[PDB]
Amino acid sequence: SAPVRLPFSGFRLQKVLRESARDKIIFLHGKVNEASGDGDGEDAVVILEKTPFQVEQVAQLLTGSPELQLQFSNDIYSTYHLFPPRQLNDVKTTVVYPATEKHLQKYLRQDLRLIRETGDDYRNITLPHLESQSLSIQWVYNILDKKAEADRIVFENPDPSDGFVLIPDLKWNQQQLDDLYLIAICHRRGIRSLRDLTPEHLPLLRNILHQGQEAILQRYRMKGDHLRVYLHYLPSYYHLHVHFTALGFEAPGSGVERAHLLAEVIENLECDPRHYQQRTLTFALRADDPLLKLLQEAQQ
Amino acid sequence: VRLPFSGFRLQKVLRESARDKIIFLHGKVNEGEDAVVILEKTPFQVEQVAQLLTGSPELQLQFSNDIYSTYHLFPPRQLNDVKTTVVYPATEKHLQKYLRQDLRLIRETGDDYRNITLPHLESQSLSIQWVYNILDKKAEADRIVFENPDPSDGFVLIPDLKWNQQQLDDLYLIAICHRRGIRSLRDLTPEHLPLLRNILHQGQEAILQRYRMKGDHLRVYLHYLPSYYHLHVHFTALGFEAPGSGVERAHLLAEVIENLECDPRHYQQRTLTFALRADDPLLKLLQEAQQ
Ligand SMILES: C[n+]1cn([C@@H]2O[C@H](CSP(=O)(O)O[P@](=O)(S)OP(=O)(O)SC[C@H]3O[C@@H](n4cnc5c(=O)nc(N)[nH]c54)[C@H](O)[C@@H]3O)[C@@H](O)[C@H]2O)c2nc(N)[nH]c(=O)c21
């Protein structure tokens, strides 16, 4: 059977978590599985995002007879409503079910605040707090165990200590290289973030950088100098992973307040073995995040 | 109801943004005459999204993993609207306005800068007279928000030209140091730490006094490569993903300060990563040298 259903029965919109006109994305909190009519459904998050244009698809459309509705016109400039064929109309849909209260908070629209976390702040405040406020990494384990997305793996170094799995993300429809996005997940368990990195991890990091880039060149004919390769801090999930993005893709999470180039991570560890245990890291938090209050009050 | 021309041979993509779901196309028409066609996906309407999702929409499962799954959603015609802008006939000036070249990443070692980049910079006529006019109060003096007048440790804080200051969502100011001869990060030593600390602390305090926005709302960073070779620092609202704030170009001022405190020769010895346009002669010079 063609899989054509959401993973639940019925969708009721509880509230809009966040929408962006410039990004053409919307985050939805839904209530599902309410066949009894008691208004007590499970939580689900549904993310909808319009897709980028495909160059040759739009080129063929413009050379024919497109369906247009005139909006504005003045001298050489004019604006239309275009209703394109089915090919240009697909909407990327991401579902989280069952969604946790943590999922509702991370997607709820909030103003951001910057914070600078010393090595001491991490050990005394952040690390104790995140242990109970972290999302499950079962999806990470499923990929490593070949329990999910095995056919989507682009490259794998199977070594338990220095190996990793290279795989597309949730969003990249793989229809164009302009928005290329892949993630590399290390096989070694227990590496929560940059804070756990030591020179012991230099072989792993070099493997991800050089084998990951070569795999992208082999599979997509995408040269290394077309790629932005980095890590997140704070990471979304506390299992070490690296982001491979097209340089021309203004990818979310590539800002300086979250992204750390993998090549510089390697060189920092080579220059100082205790770099990411002692140095201060700067990142952004939601204004109502209790971790922000804990860090702000310890810094007084 | 139809386009003001017949046929469309794509000459080149002027620019594209997968993040913004927009594309700028240069086409040859009536074959040829020049035309610019801009296509942009439209934002979601909450009512249309709610009505569709509550009533069995057409979906195709891509894959699932634990509690996560991705689908292709095929909405009705009411949600597929594409904003289409046409310039016909388009001029050479229109093409220059929209065209952008692809970006290529490059890593410049300390020796690369001294042997390759700096001789290339010196071979060009890079005028920063407009910078001197601001510092000397001969232009844009009415735009200055704050000044430390010290000739060595001082600076002028000025809003970005593209910020009309009518809202704080896109807050963007620039701090230009008074001291001359500091091309970029490459010229920084611990002797500039008083200047850099002044920019960080006095700059944030001035933005708090003038815009009622405290420091943790701000992203304070420098560019490498900078657009002009006179040291300047960018102050941007954190919620504003300003161009040039990506990891491939921005350097947090606090980290620049602490790097100089940990190693005086940091920015003369360490390798810096940045993007260049594919047609930039500096890109070829660095690639040939690194061969
Ligand atoms: C659960 N899961 C995660 N990922 C990817 O791993 C990374 C997680 S960390 P990141 O900081 O990039 O974003 P994040 O939203 S916390 O990831 P997420 O797990 O919550 S899924 C939401 C998606 O929506 C995108 N997003 C988020 N905010 C915005 C935004 O403001 N604007 C836009 N245009 N896009 C945005 C993200 O890039 C993400 O791809 C992402 O690249 C995910 O795509 C996975 N990949 C595989 N193959 N399978 C998995 O199950 C899996």
Task: Give structural attributes.
homodimer, 300 residues, alpha+beta, Phosphorylase Kinase, domain 1, HIT family, subunit A, 2 domains, hydrolase
Provide the β-strand percentage band of chain A: 25-35%
Helix content of chain A: 25-40%
Report the major sheet of chain A. 6 strands, antiparallel
CATH topology of the largest domain in chain A: HIT family, subunit A
| Count of structural domains of chain A | 2
The assigned CATH architecture of the largest domain in chain A is 2-Layer Sandwich
- Find the count of extended strands of chain A (DSSP E, 2+ residues): 14
EC number (chain B): 3.6.1.59
Family (chain B): Belongs to the HIT family.
Motif (nuclear export sequence (NES)) (chain B): 97-109
Protein name (chain B): m7GpppX diphosphatase
What is this structure's SSE topology?
The structure is a homodimer.
Chain A: E1 11-20, E2 25-32, E3 42-50, H1 55-62, E4 68-74, E5 77-82, E6 91-96, H2 101-107, E7 112-117, H3 119-130, H4 138-144, E8 155-157, E9 164-168, E10 181-186, H5 202-220, E11 227-232, E12 241-246, E13 259-261, H6 262-271, H7 275-278, E14 281-286, H8 290-299
Antiparallel strand pairs in A: 1-2, 2-3, 3-6, 4-5, 7-14, 8-9, 9-10, 10-12, 11-12, 11-13
Helix pairs in contact in A: 3-8, 5-6
The complex binds ligand AJQ.
Residues 23, 25, 47, 49, 94, 139, 149, 167-171, 183, 232, 236, 252-253 of chain A line the site of ligand AJQ.
